[PDB]
Amino acid sequence: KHNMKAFLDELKAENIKKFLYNFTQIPHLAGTEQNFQLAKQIQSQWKEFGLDSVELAHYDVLLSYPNKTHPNYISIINEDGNEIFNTSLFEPPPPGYENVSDIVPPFSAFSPQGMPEGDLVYVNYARTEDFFKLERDMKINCSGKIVIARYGKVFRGNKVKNAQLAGAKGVILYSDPADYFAPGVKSYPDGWNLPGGGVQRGNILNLNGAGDPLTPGYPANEYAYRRGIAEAVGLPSIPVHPIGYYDAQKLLEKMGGSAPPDSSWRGSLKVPYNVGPGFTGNFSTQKVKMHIHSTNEVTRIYNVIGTLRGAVEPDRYVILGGHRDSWVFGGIDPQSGAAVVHEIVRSFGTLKKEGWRPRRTILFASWDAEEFGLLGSTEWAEENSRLLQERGVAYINADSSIEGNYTLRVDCTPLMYSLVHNLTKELKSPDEGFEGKSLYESWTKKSPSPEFSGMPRISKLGSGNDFEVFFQRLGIASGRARYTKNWETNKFSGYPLYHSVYETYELVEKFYDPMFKYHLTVAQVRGGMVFELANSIVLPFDCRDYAVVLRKYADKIYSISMKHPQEMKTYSVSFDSLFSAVKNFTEIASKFSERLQDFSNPIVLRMMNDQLMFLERAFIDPLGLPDRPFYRHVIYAPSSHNKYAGESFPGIYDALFDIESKVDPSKAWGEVKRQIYVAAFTVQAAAETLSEVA
Amino acid sequence: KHNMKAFLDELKAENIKKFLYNFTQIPHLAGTEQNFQLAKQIQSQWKEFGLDSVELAHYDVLLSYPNKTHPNYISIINEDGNEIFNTSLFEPPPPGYENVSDIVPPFSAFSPQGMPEGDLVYVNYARTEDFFKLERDMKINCSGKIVIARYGKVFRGNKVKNAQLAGAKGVILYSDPADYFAPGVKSYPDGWNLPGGGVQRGNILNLNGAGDPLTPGYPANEYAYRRGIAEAVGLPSIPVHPIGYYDAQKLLEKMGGSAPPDSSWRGSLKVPYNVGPGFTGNFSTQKVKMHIHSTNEVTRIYNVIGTLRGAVEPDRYVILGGHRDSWVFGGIDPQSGAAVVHEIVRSFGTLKKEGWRPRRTILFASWDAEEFGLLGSTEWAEENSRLLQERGVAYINADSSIEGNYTLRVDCTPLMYSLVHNLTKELKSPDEGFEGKSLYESWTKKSPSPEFSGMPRISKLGSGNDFEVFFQRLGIASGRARYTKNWETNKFSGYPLYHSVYETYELVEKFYDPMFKYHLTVAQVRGGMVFELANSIVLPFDCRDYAVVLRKYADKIYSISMKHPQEMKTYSVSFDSLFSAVKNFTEIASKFSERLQDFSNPIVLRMMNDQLMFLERAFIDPLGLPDRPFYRHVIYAPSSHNKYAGESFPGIYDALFDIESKVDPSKAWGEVKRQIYVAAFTVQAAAETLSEVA
Ligand SMILES: *[C@@H]1O[C@H](CO)[C@@H](O[C@@H]2O[C@H](CO)[C@@H](O[C@@H]3O[C@H](CO)[C@@H](O)[C@H](O[C@H]4O[C@H](CO)[C@@H](O)[C@H](O)[C@@H]4O)[C@@H]3O)[C@H](O)[C@H]2NC(C)=O)[C@H](O)[C@H]1NC(C)=O
Ligand SMILES: *[C@@H]1O[C@H](CO)[C@@H](O[C@@H]2O[C@H](CO)[C@@H](O[C@@H]3O[C@H](CO)[C@@H](O)[C@H](O[C@H]4O[C@H](CO)[C@@H](O)[C@H](O)[C@@H]4O)[C@@H]3O)[C@H](O)[C@H]2NC(C)=O)[C@H](O)[C@H]1NC(C)=O
Ligand SMILES: *[C@@H]1O[C@H](CO)[C@@H](O[C@@H]2O[C@H](CO)[C@@H](O[C@@H]3O[C@H](CO)[C@@H](O)[C@H](O)[C@@H]3O)[C@H](O)[C@H]2NC(C)=O)[C@H](O)[C@H]1NC(C)=O
Ligand SMILES: *[C@@H]1O[C@H](CO)[C@@H](O[C@@H]2O[C@H](CO)[C@@H](O[C@@H]3O[C@H](CO)[C@@H](O)[C@H](O)[C@@H]3O)[C@H](O)[C@H]2NC(C)=O)[C@H](O)[C@H]1NC(C)=O
Ligand SMILES: *[C@@H]1O[C@H](CO[C@@H]2O[C@@H](C)[C@@H](O)[C@@H](O)[C@@H]2O)[C@@H](O[C@@H]2O[C@H](CO)[C@@H](O)[C@H](O)[C@H]2NC(C)=O)[C@H](O)[C@H]1NC(C)=O
Ligand SMILES: *[C@@H]1O[C@H](CO[C@@H]2O[C@@H](C)[C@@H](O)[C@@H](O)[C@@H]2O)[C@@H](O[C@@H]2O[C@H](CO)[C@@H](O)[C@H](O)[C@H]2NC(C)=O)[C@H](O)[C@H]1NC(C)=O
Ligand SMILES: O=C(N[C@@H](CCCCNC(=O)c1ccc(I)cc1)C(=O)O)N[C@@H](Cc1ccco1)C(=O)O
Ligand SMILES: O=C(N[C@@H](CCCCNC(=O)c1ccc(I)cc1)C(=O)O)N[C@@H](Cc1ccco1)C(=O)O
Ligand SMILES: *[C@@H]1O[C@H](CO)[C@@H](O[C@@H]2O[C@H](CO)[C@@H](O)[C@H](O)[C@H]2NC(C)=O)[C@H](O)[C@H]1NC(C)=O
Ligand SMILES: *[C@@H]1O[C@H](CO)[C@@H](O[C@@H]2O[C@H](CO)[C@@H](O)[C@H](O)[C@H]2NC(C)=O)[C@H](O)[C@H]1NC(C)=O
Ligand SMILES: *[C@@H]1O[C@H](CO)[C@@H](O)[C@H](O)[C@H]1NC(C)=O
Ligand SMILES: *[C@@H]1O[C@H](CO)[C@@H](O)[C@H](O)[C@H]1NC(C)=O
Ligand SMILES: *[C@@H]1O[C@H](CO)[C@@H](O)[C@H](O)[C@H]1NC(C)=O
Ligand SMILES: *[C@@H]1O[C@H](CO)[C@@H](O)[C@H](O)[C@H]1NC(C)=O
Ligand SMILES: *[C@@H]1O[C@H](CO)[C@@H](O)[C@H](O)[C@H]1NC(C)=O
């Protein structure tokens, strides 16, 4: 038989291992020849594996690279203008790779050029609350200063935006051992910790879902009209550069001015973590000078798009996508995901060669330039948005399969919760101590839901990966799953060697997953989801799970507002419409579920499958969220303070955020009430798509 | 049998006559008690007639009314401040109606209040070209003047916007006998011409598709957040008032300053048509003073929505809608349309009582507050936009059925051209001299297409009626058809008694259509279209007709640009992408048509019907047109100079319009190139929705 079990049994840990090795021998940076040749290899192999069609879709997008003959670095400069300390020009390469040539040195992609020189201010993680503490409580002014911030907690592009708005003339980002060195484990190559010369690469854009900075709204094809660089979307306005903790210590050790305000501001280096501005008495005449000479350049990128045509509903698409471009070797990010996608395609292709086809079409995607701001997935979705919004059932992401070995981590729409619970109940746990137990059992024990007992935690979707355009812009049900660590306060920081030259095949094979059993478990979860979405007769979406979370999110946003009861009385701020809409959604969803269970009629089936598919699409507002036109989902958006985190009722949340500091409270509370109306209307409108159709 | 012929044979001229009489005995102004009672009557009768459900959908929208105890009027005022001439406070009521009480006096809906006093400038029809002629050629400055313009040629809201941008402090609109008095026919009540005391009412908004000024984007329901009046969408900023030609003559006869520039500026009154500013020598110290005291008021409105559920595809909607609110009695506008809709519902209901149901659901709508800017249809479409865009097959409008007795007039999407040609070939001509001939034959003879011989003229959709939100915002295939006059240069001016108190049942029954045979023919065309759209197995849309017109429109926009060959060389302005997209659309449409003819399989059928239904939807840009976010169709939009007219490739057309007067030609031509890219991309994307789906 050709059922899910046949699909899952065909997946092999050894094939994932072979593919990971094959994908991680040389760098695959977006826009380079090496990454194009890998695209061509994947296209060939996907054809060999049995897909019906495999094409490259290319776009010409803005990328950013350092200048090979004018390197980026930071100095401490004395009063005479002598540079008395320089940061490193490259990461010491790992054993056996000291002769690879095109390793991009650490840089912050899309930094502008400049040579600012000034006094340092240390800003902890440069979060919104860290800048509030500095400016409002400590009365430290960042205007015209160079800020130094530790990586961790939030997306680095939020740090840079926060620093810009504080008036900084430059930003230095560094990896503190408190966040990137787990106690009792050795540095690479002898363990999985970050060495003091290691550096986290990464883009610092604030695109808000736009994709290529030069072509927001439209694919960057051959005839595209491009904005001038001056009007580009999302580019930072001050220079930025990342460094390791050896270099950081040299910059921080001389810092004077004010003491850190409390211990949550101190990392693990042997320095005071003084906030500054500037250095202590003897060194008060020294400054810090940045030298950034990176260039933005329009460059071709290539997505590989494979199709497996559905036997019954070929005009319904289930998409499995993950990226292929990496900062250097991409041992975990993304090749641990891409190797899993490759084995999934191979398994589906094996069933196809035996005469099986899925009910619905499955599309497989190897995205390019994810690391430069989701550019490949976003441009392709802009080009195909009409097909996707009328035909897209679901998107399953597949970036890194492992970021640890402790338990499963899942973020997805409420519509997929029941599908995930059911699938993980049928899969074996790979975990030591849980042999013979289901993955659901181990995951639930190690990652319990805060709300419901005997249930695992599943988080909200924000941004940070290639599902962003499908879910936040187009309203296609989306999910992602990976194996993760037991390190709660680090859930947005990345594993220690994230975006460093040390993320290699050897890292994975020696320290993360020697038997590739976590990779296999993740392949079964991602592949199993895709199989069910593409083959179930009734789409495996449960609208009642949306009703449950909408009530939770309504209670949550109400409680935030209720911290200001006098203003709610004065401006007559009522959440009654929103609770009414949620109650209506609950009632209608319950009746729809009864009809779904209680209807031979393929028109009623498809009519009902269309109601399930368009339910996610009903939460899209075509006017978008305030000043973020490409974030259109009214229930979820990437947090305005941390792109990696999803926020619920984001329009209301942002209207209430720091509202007590607004200078026209009438206007601020007016905007809260406007966002309550937009949310109540959208919840009711979504509920009405589940009513009887006539 | 229950086929189209059974449907059409059930329609009776005598029933339309009875309904028209019933609908036109008292005024039915939007927001009044009388119009609510008519809504309730229609809902009851639609239930009686056999519809499955009939509901009222109500909204609270901004309306505008004169002040009953502070009337609007215009004076000529002497240097002492004595008002030596006053315009009329009301139209002399027609015979037998001199005792109806709630006849709204002539006013311009949404005029602000004011009492401006100044010198007059006559601006012909106040079109964009009339203001160019005045300011650029004649060097007459309108700043701080009161403008007087004749009605006709373009929507009166465009006149007022043009006057505002010229710096006028007020606008007087009047009906010139050249435009509203056909030679050799008598004034009402003895013929169909406008008497000198008659006045055309009408709104002067420039909403650009927004609907209710206070709630753009969202339905004006019970919890809606409203903009403050200061931020309302579309309201004029200077007072405006309409008058008849008796009053106009008194204002124009004293005009001095410059002679009219040519004879196209002279109407039929016995005046010089001097442009001014101000009056001739002896009267040079007299001024004109307006007194406008109308108020904007949020008021409840009621749509009646009837459903006839489809037997096979109940989740696909064919909509027949027209409005019910009128300025006074609405003898032609809209009750000649509403009476036709009522008889259509009655006929469909008769078939239903015999056990028939249409294949698809049919929705019937009696819209409110159309006269105040399409408010009822727009608010309902904002409330139901998720259902409409995923389920809406087509919208057929049904406002006035007759505006003359000469021949048919049709405006619709290219997707309906073949349906209209085929249907009118099967219908009998009502025209004298064409007995025994088809309607297609008479219509083609009297209204030949400019392009193709042996084909009738069909025009583009812009705005001016309730189809606007379904087509321009949502991208639902839309059409309209009525009987019209032989008076080409008056096609946007209205018939002589348009929006006057004299538009009565007697007008229609004595002078337009005594045997109700034109009404019946129009019922067969509108009803026949709805029947075919709701009952055909394959949707009756021909994508090849879109391919043909896209080439015509591309050639047209190219030829406009080619009036500036030096600039096209300098800024490298190429239409190659657009012609490439159109060529691709033609090729793909041809292959799709072959598959459609050449595919028992209901999934392939519905997949194919979905491709036909979503084809119109593919021309929608979710970013909208420049500064008009609610006009989202890339091929068509209401002309920026005349809301009543449709313009093709409107983004490119507006970028090229008057481009030789722009002060930064680099920037202006940049924007032309951007619009060519958006159009080429959208044509290609629409073409790709017709490709094989996988
Ligand atoms: C949740 O679903 C319910 C349906 O179960 C839906 O209920 C609707 O509530 C609206 C808004 O409250 C009701 O609107 C009323 O409609 C009546 C006529 O039916 C009007 O007369 C009412 O207006 C009068 O009263 C107002 C309130 O005091 C006054 O402001 C107004 O000026 C009038 O005096 C009012 O508009 C509607 O009838 C029901 N529909 C039902 C029960 O079927 C509810 O709105 C949904 N929640 C959301 C957020 O959509
Ligand atoms: C109408 O449909 C046709 C398909 O029949 C579609 O054709 C596509 O045209 C594009 C744009 O011209 C082609 O893009 C080329 O793709 C190749 C690889 O396949 C690239 O190497 C090309 O880039 C090189 O050449 C460029 C042009 O001089 C250089 O600027 C560039 O830097 C490179 O040197 C180029 O991108 C594409 O291959 C075809 N697809 C086909 C034939 O299948 C056409 O675009 C459609 N029209 C519209 C408006 O969409
Ligand atoms: C996850 O798995 C659960 C448990 O299998 C699924 O719920 C179950 O789904 C079936 C099919 O709809 C339900 O069976 C129905 O039961 C009623 C009897 O009341 C009968 O009328 C129908 O003909 C049908 O047999 C079953 O009750 C239900 N079990 C529950 C809710 O506990 C769930 O659907 C799966 N989720 C997915 C696939 O997304
Ligand atoms: C308007 O009426 C015309 C004339 O009836 C319709 O065109 C005709 O449509 C039929 C059905 O698709 C075509 O018949 C087909 O012919 C081919 C033979 O080549 C055969 O393979 C199919 O099985 C089928 O019999 C017919 O050719 C075609 N006539 C034309 C184009 O001249 C047209 O479809 C109607 N438009 C509507 C309903 O929108
Ligand atoms: C820190 O580096 C500066 C700049 O040196 C250049 O860039 C470096 C990162 C590296 O690539 C060098 O080879 C480059 O010369 C050093 O200052 C320079 O010193 C040279 C030689 O003495 C002198 O001719 C240049 O003018 C200097 N340039 C500047 C901008 O000052 C500096 O010595 C280094 N400091 C330390 C402590 O090593
Ligand atoms: C033109 O009308 C003005 C204003 O009259 C008022 O509004 C009119 C339209 C009508 O409703 C009148 O009944 C109102 O009184 C006339 O000027 C007024 O004349 C009255 C009586 O002589 C005097 O007490 C008012 O102060 C005047 N008001 C103003 C604003 O001037 C005027 O006589 C009329 N002109 C002609 C030629 O009939
Ligand atoms: O590197 C990433 N994403 C990495 C982020 C690792 C940091 C941990 N962050 C999480 O958001 C996370 C990880 C797993 C799950 I299941 C849910 C959330 C990833 O999603 O695996 N994206 C790029 C590109 C990008 C585009 C937009 C924002 O970031 C970047 O962060 O530099
Ligand atoms: O009165 C109308 N519409 C009338 C306009 C009569 C003037 C002739 N205009 C045409 O645009 C026309 C008439 C028939 C066809 I088939 C195609 C076009 C109508 O469509 O019958 N609408 C209102 C309300 C409105 C809203 C937005 C703009 O106008 C108005 O013009 O005051
Ligand atoms: C990764 O695997 C691919 C596929 O097996 C290898 O590419 C093949 O290399 C052989 C030997 O040169 C050629 O004969 C084939 O034509 C290639 N197949 C393709 C591109 O589909 C590639 O060598 C491997 N890469 C590494 C680093 O091991
Ligand atoms: C228009 O027609 C309607 C429907 O026939 C008339 O309304 C009916 O009036 C009779 C007599 O008063 C009542 O018994 C019915 O209850 C009404 N039916 C409804 C409202 O559905 C109405 O009188 C006619 N109007 C005019 C102006 O002739
Ligand atoms: C990179 O720097 C080199 C060496 O100084 C310079 O000649 C070249 O212009 C730069 N390349 C750029 C800016 O792309
Ligand atoms: C910070 O410093 C600059 C001048 O150096 C000044 O313009 C700005 O207002 C200061 N802000 C605060 C809060 O002191
Ligand atoms: C794998 O799990 C073991 C046992 O709990 C742990 O000690 C080891 O460090 C894990 N590896 C990683 C990278 O987390
Ligand atoms: C209308 O005018 C009357 C009579 O002068 C006045 O008392 C009232 O305020 C006005 N009504 C309005 C502005 O709605
Ligand atoms: C029209 O008149 C006003 C002043 O009365 C002036 O500001 C404006 O520039 C004038 N325009 C032209 C074109 O003369």
Ligand SMILES: *[C@@H]1O[C@H](CO)[C@@H](O)[C@H](O)[C@H]1NC(C)=O
């Ligand atoms: C009806 O048609 C006749 C004959 O051509 C014409 O003379 C008459 O004026 C028409 N009525 C209207 C309102 O056009």
Ligand SMILES: [Ca+2]
């Ligand atoms: Ca783009």
Ligand SMILES: [Ca+2]
């Ligand atoms: Ca509205």
Ligand SMILES: [Cl-]
């Ligand atoms: Cl992922």
Ligand SMILES: [Cl-]
């Ligand atoms: Cl109409």
Ligand SMILES: [Zn+2]
């Ligand atoms: Zn990644």
Ligand SMILES: [Zn+2]
């Ligand atoms: Zn990454």
Ligand SMILES: [Zn+2]
């Ligand atoms: Zn009308």
Ligand SMILES: [Zn+2]
């Ligand atoms: Zn009208």
